[PDB]
């Protein structure tokens, strides 16, 4: 398979790893009674463990010789072989949220610079104003492009202080 | 009351509330969707 | 395992370059010390004024960079 | 003569949230609001520096008094939480039945992101984090047997916490004492000696006689905890007590007729340790607290208040003058009734020293049942109370220096002791400098000698028990005297105060509780390392105090204040001349000294005291390897650090894995601190300029101008992260090691 | 101006210091070095003999210990020589002069080596 | 000795002279500023290089500048 | 106004002494003398540590470096409203009057003073270091 890896569903090491993890919990479960709270907690952990190994194999992760899932980061390989949900799709999930936070903060900063005392709005947050901007940040990718195309995203060099050179 | 709600709008208090909320949201998602490593 | 350590090495190269490059390009002056070139490559500081100016010389930037070079190597 | 009386002001400060919404209100400099990020840091650094906000001593005193109620309120919440978690999230009831085979636990983690592995199998049908604070052993000693009793204490703690916070509000906003009230030092000492300490000890002795002793007597007899009479039944039924202690059949008549020998059944002088629990006899502690109560109630009648009798502290000081010291103690009464910093300097110095004494006395004479054989608790308590003492002692140096800069006044100190100490400060510091060099060469140099000889294959040339010997004969002589005390110099004591002096070991649950501690060459060498490290810490701190106001380098240091970065690159460079900077350097040396103290304690106890007892004898945890290995640096690196770090670095996948993570996390924080200690703000401010340019380019530059930390804050951040990382590293290392092999 | 103490200003202390060859003016610098040399050379053999690498050898210990002390006297004499060269280049006491110090250093060598030899004779 | 220079941006506020711990600076008559006085550095053999004068100067950039130079007993601040 | 002449006979403030005073430098290189007239007996702080009492009338103290004399001058001027002066005294007996140099304290502009080390340009108008290279020694562009 990709880069000599093998699917985790077909990996002997992957299957062996699950047995060891469950075996460790089973050993601890012997010293407790069937209905006792420690027994219930240990079995709940065992159910989660079995579900975890079942889900990762179902998702089609590739496993190395160690039996551990390995992620695929090249967009071409990820999209060609159905690994887009490992790095590629998460990539755009992050950039949407990260830009959301950045864009909302930038809007608040610009909004309060027109006030009488801008610095007072940075240590005592204008929560009504902050809340309104938070909800409107869901469309930042559209808003950001329009500023880029309108020439208003960036400031002109003549207004930026620099040191002597 | 105006002054007290002004106090609750200071940076440390807002940060406490916002991070308590953000942490709660992330913890509760992992409670109902445990061990997420990939998107399916 | 090779993936993670190679990005550690890139972190070291870029941070060491940042300190050395910043030292070179600010060697002649900065907003904090506009006339730095009048004081030479190596000098103690410019005193506690203007907020405090410890390790402001280009020589001190090199001194900081050596720690990062050792960490990177 | 001024009458000692209550004096307050009605409604001095209105209770309002107006100032909560005005950050920096307390200071004239900061009340105008931020223009740079330095304002934000300055807000917090000056928050509790009350005397820098005003010169009125009455206003300062009132803030101090109510801040103290706030501290007490927080402590009551903390105590209430400990009792509550013992009532609701512990295995205390199960532990009471089988104290040796169950590990105390009072913290349970939620199952989330896989962290429930930290709920280890600690026994008693329970899962949780194993605690080392020793609360279980404290609770058993006081006679607590059920979760209900723990729960009720937690509720009462919250009621006290609310009362403390009410008192703080009440005594600042409603009835604030006047300055004359605070200055009744004679009355305060009478009440704090006779009342706080005397009555407190008497009351606790009352609890021990009526609750602790009867309950612990039945527990040590194998009686089941649930079959033991409830404490109020013991109080109301003299017949039940008379069964346990026959002298109770005579009531309180023997006390009032001076037939005190009747109470020998519960007021004893046994000494040694209870062979069942491995702790001190509770009948000995009860007699101790009775005797202490009488002593402090007598002490509380020494000072004159309102009825002629008693001493004037001012008259005592002024009388004690001699030929060699000029005016002597004149002016000290005025200093100590007008400067909080002077008072805090003395109180921190001894409170910190007291903490270190507690660390030594509790390991050697374990006062709680089943404490001695809980090696995890023994190591933790000693380490904890040693560190508190060290930190407190450094604070004494800091606030002595603050008094020197802010409160010292030459007009009131002419040719008295304080004035004369200043006038030969060069003689004091120069000699102390020489002693440190002598101690450094002849203590650490011995290790270097030993490492070199061992590396060259000349073990016969080493300082060791099998070679050139350095016996601590003075310490050995003292041990023998204390072991023989019951025969001659303490005739009424059955046994010596501690088993460390000599004699036979006490084993509880197949493990050594305490046994004699032998002192060889390795012990001689490490004690003179302790002498070296303490003397240097004193040197740094004392120098900062004596030169706080001036020196040959900076003739007017007093005008520059307690805390300033330097006085410029001139005179060859004057970085870190201020007194604050001496506290900064003193912290590092305090950390260096107490690290060796606790490493000494950890290795010595594992090697020569702690261990398992069987038919073949006593096998110590590290097999007695301290004597021959602890005399070389390589011995400490190999046999202590490398060997004993095995537990912590192998804890991943177990309940102790949290200590493995913190072990690495603490190494990180320590190394992170070197960034602040090695560099200077001038570099960082110039870096921030470029980053600001990028934010300007994108119209996202903040209105509060970013600034690099001040020079002094860079040092404060550096040392704070250094200490936290260094201490937290050893914390993880100790707990993972001792909870695993203990 | 200066702080006067019994240690700094006492009659017994002052009289003792004046008697020492270092402070005994009116004596030839060479004689001063010999007296100072003898005193220091004699004591120097002690630690080397009792704590050297050959201390446990029955008879070699005395020779090695005193022989090493003699080597230290030579090093010390060289230190005195160069000190005079540096300190005095361009007054009441002849000792503090270019010629006087050189004579004083020479006396220290002769006295020091003799003191080491005398110590060896006492041992054996 | 250190090198101290006064530049024509001085406003004659006198704060550098008041702050000098060595009495290196003094005020002299001038006509280039409203105060009609300018700072002067007549005795630079006594300058220790502390730069308290630079800390006190209000103008932007500084009107009094210290360049650390050769070290003597005076400039080093030694009392021995 | 004329340069005062030092009077060695002047009494000194009452002071028991300390270890922070003069060293061998005073005997071989130079020391400093400060004198002032006191309106009354009063306690002041010595720059070398400790408290001393100034005698009513003339006072005289000796210090090891110039900064010590000026540090006491600042204290006396600001806290007691006095007018001290000090000298530099050489081992051969020569006396050099120092402060105030012309009888008027430097912070007050006085006629007859000649500007020194005054550049008739801004800091930003200094030349680049390359223009003063190989001038015979190390020198800043601010030295031209
Ligand atoms: C960070 C740099 C980087 C690197 C080193 C690679 C490397 C690689 N990519 Mg990837 N790729 C990247 C970024 C990168 N990619 C990005 C940012 C995108 C999104 C725009 C893609 C989109 C992409 C696609 C769509 C494909 C690859 C493919 C490949 C592999 C073979 C083609 C090749 O010669 O690529 C060397 C890379 C470069 C010279 C840089 C530009 C590469 C472009 C974007 C793709 C070229 C595809 C190529 C013409 C396909 C030929 C047929 C194929 C069957 C071999 C190779 C391992 C191919 C593959 O093996 O898919 C399974 C493939 O089909 N990549
Ligand atoms: C570079 C840093 C980094 C990264 C990329 C990750 C990534 C991840 N960590 Mg890890 N982690 C890190 C640092 C990091 N970690 C550190 C420093 C620690 C120590 C505190 C941990 C401790 C830790 C634990 C204990 C766990 C993880 C887990 C996870 C996974 C969480 C996925 C999730 O919650 O989806 C939820 C889905 C989302 C979409 C989240 C965002 C939700 C918003 C509402 C989306 C809005 C979109 C419009 C993910 C693979 C968990 C796991 O299962 O890993 C396999 C897990 O149990 N991490
Ligand atoms: C020093 C004081 C202190 C500390 C550090 C803790 C710490 C803790 N407590 Mg405890 N607690 C305390 C005092 C304290 N408590 C007091 C005084 C009471 C009585 C009112 C309680 C009553 C209490 C309960 C009832 C519970 C805890 C629980 C907890 C845990 C989870 C808390 C959490 O995440 O809340 C969530 C965070 C926010 C709401 C913010 C945590 C280990 C929980 C626990 O042990 O769960 C197993 C739990 O259920 N505590
Ligand atoms: C609800 C009642 C109330 C109100 C409205 C006020 C109002 C006022 N008080 Mg008063 N006070 C109160 C209760 C109250 N006080 C109590 C209970 C006490 C006893 C402690 C005091 C003691 C007191 C003093 C000694 C002083 C005031 C002062 C003030 C003024 C400024 C307050 C300020 O800036 O607070 C903002 C401050 C905070 C929010 C800090 C809170 C600190 C507490 C102790 C909790 C800290 C706990 C926390 C967990 C610590 C660890 C943190 C860690 C986990 C990160 C203002 C008029 C000051 C003044 O200038 O008066 C003229 C002043 O000097 N008060
Ligand atoms: C017998 C009387 C008595 C007692 C028991 C105390 C006890 C205490 N005083 Mg002292 N004090 C007294 C008389 C007394 N004082 C007198 C007469 C004066 C005036 C000269 C002072 C002036 C004074 C000051 C200025 C300060 C103290 C402080 C303290 C506390 C030190 C910390 C400690 O050990 O906590 C141990 C804690 C406990 C044992 C908890 C005990 C709680 C209960 C309610 C008893 C508190 C004592 C109180 C006088 C009871 C009546 C109060 C009121 C309802 C009438 C402590 C609670 C310091 C402090 O922290 O104040 C807040 C402090 O700053 N005291
Ligand atoms: C502070 C510590 C303390 C306290 C509180 C107690 C308390 C007690 N001891 Mg103990 N004891 C102590 C220290 C203490 N002891 C010490 C140090 C020793 C060693 C010398 C002893 C040795 C000892 C012995 C040998 C005995 C006791 C006994 C007792 C009990 C009876 C005492 C008695 O006869 O009182 C006599 C009377 C009083 C104390 C006065 C009571 C006044 C009341 C409270 C006034 C209420 C007035 C009010 C208006 C009422 C309003 C009502 C409302 C509903 C309207 C009692 C529970 C006896 C017992 O039976 O123990 C089980 C007993 O035999 N003790
Ligand atoms: C009874 C104890 C006591 C008291 C009442 C005080 C009181 C005071 N001290 Mg003193 N001090 C003490 C002990 C004490 N000190 C000790 C033990 C030391 C040695 C370390 C010092 C060293 C010291 C110095 C060097 C200075 C003071 C200063 C002050 C004053 C201002 C404090 C302030 O504003 O803090 C504001 C509080 C903070 C900024 C918070 C600091 C938090 C630290 C850095 C980290 C805590 C980490 C935490 C425990 C664990 C990690 C948590 C994290 C992971 C979240 C005030 C009068 C200052 C002054 O100028 O006084 C005139 C000053 O400069 N103290
Ligand atoms: C391992 C690191 C280290 C070492 C070796 C030292 C050494 C010293 N420190 Mg320092 N210090 C350190 C770290 C260290 N420090 C750090 C990290 C800090 C920052 C917090 C400081 C902060 C600090 C302060 C603030 C002070 C010291 C002081 C001292 C001195 C104590 C007196 C003494 O023992 O002298 C004897 C020297 C030693 C014990 C060092 C080893 C000596 C070897 C074994 C001798 C070898 C001899 C041999 C003939 C060599 C020949 C070589 C060749 C020519 C052939 C000493 C010079 C104190 C001082 O100066 O006291 C007077 C003092 O005030 N230190
Ligand atoms: C020993 C010194 C005793 C000293 C002793 O007993 O002094 C006692 C001696 C008695 O003086 P007075 O009789 O005048 O005391 C009157 C008192 O009421 C204080 O005013 O005090 C002094 O001489 C003060 C200065 C002593 C300075 C001592 C310098 C040497 C210190 C050495 C430190 C060694 C520490 C070892 C620790 C184990
Ligand atoms: C690293 C370093 C800096 C740079 C460090 C800085 C500027 C401190 C940075 C602190 C935080 C991270 C920045 C401010 C954070 C805000 C409160 C916003 C937080 C936002 C979150 C809540 C999301 C110095 O300024 C310095 C000064 C003197 C000696 C050494 C050093 C030094 O080593
Ligand atoms: S602390 Fe900083 S500014 Fe002050 S002299 Fe030292 S290096 Fe210069
Ligand atoms: S550097 Fe110091 S001594 Fe020199 S002129 Fe400036 S303030 Fe005066
Ligand atoms: S402080 Fe600056 S502006 Fe003021 S007189 Fe001095 S050089 Fe001129």
Residue numbers in the entry:
A (entry chain F): 63 to 227
B (entry chain J): 1 to 40
C (entry chain B): 516 to 588
D (entry chain A): 10 to 751
E (entry chain L): 53 to 142, 157 to 190
F (entry chain C): 2 to 81
G (entry chain D): 53 to 196
From the study:
Being a multi-subunit complex, its macromolecular organization affects the dynamics of photosynthetic membranes. A chloroplast photosystem I (PSI) of green algae consists of a core complex and three antenna modules: inner belt, outer belt and Lhca2-Lhca9 heterodimer, which together comprise 24 subunits.
The remaining 74,209 particles containing the monomer were refined to 2.31 Å resolution, representing a considerable improvement on the previously reported maps. In our PSI monomer reconstruction, the resolution in the core is ~2.1 Å, and in the LHCI inner belt 2.1–2.5 Å, revealing additional structural details of chlorophylls, carotenoids and 621 water molecules. The quality of the data aided in improving the previous models in functionally important regions. The two newly modelled luteins 720 and 626 are in the N-terminus of Lhca3 next to Chl a 614, and in Lhca5 next to Chl a 617, respectively. Another striking feature of the high-resolution cryo-EM map is resolvable density for multiple newly detected water molecules, which particularly aided in modelling the coordination of chlorophylls. Therefore, the immediate surrounding of Chl b molecules is more enriched with non-protein material than previously thought, which plays a role in tuning the photophysics and the transport properties of excitation energy in PSI.
